[PDB]
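Per-record layout

source: Rattus norvegicus
name: DNA polymerase beta
length: 241
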Amino acid sequence: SSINFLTRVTGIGPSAARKLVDEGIKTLEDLRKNEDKLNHHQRIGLKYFEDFEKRIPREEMLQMQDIVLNEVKKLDPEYIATVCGSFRRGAESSGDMDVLLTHPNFTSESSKQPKLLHRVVEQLQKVRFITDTLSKGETKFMGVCQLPSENDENEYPHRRIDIRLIPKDQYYCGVLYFTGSDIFNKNMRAHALEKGFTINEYTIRPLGVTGVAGEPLPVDSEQDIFDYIQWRYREPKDRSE
């Protein structure tokens, strides 16, 4: 019951919740006066509880996508940025923004490179779009953003945003997977198997002997994946199927 209400503020998983519900912290006013018991993530999660339960309309998603794409293009034109999820498939509303990021200097035959993702985060912070950070990783950022409101804070709830840095050579498989549609990923994958290939969020490999996958085929576009599998390319819009 209260340890269900608690799994609702981001950051607070079931374990975290069993412990806070036992230590007597089981309501929003209780957590609101027990910040010292929470880590940075749960606390920014508590800070915008109400705003993260609000859905984001395509209208605002498109403006947010523009700010991200313009700022990233300025830092370096070779940076490829793709806002994925239901929104890329044309949804009129989204729960958050998931930006997949890559760069030709970064391939899976390379060591860490955190500055490739951090420079963007820092430029989105400086231009006052990323407002807070839940967790900053070397290849992954989960934070929060807000559209420029310019008067008494305006109806711009704070929205959740994720920016992942992917090796260039695994990027279109990542954009395919994360633009999704769960059904679609699951139908495309079964057809791949039937044509002798195994597909996942990173690569497409040819299936040899049995479970033994073989080495990764090259992919410089989503379309390359449909051609390997001999399937008419499906636009993200027709990907419910």
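summary: DSSP finds ten helices and nine strands in the chain. The longest strand covers residues 130-136.
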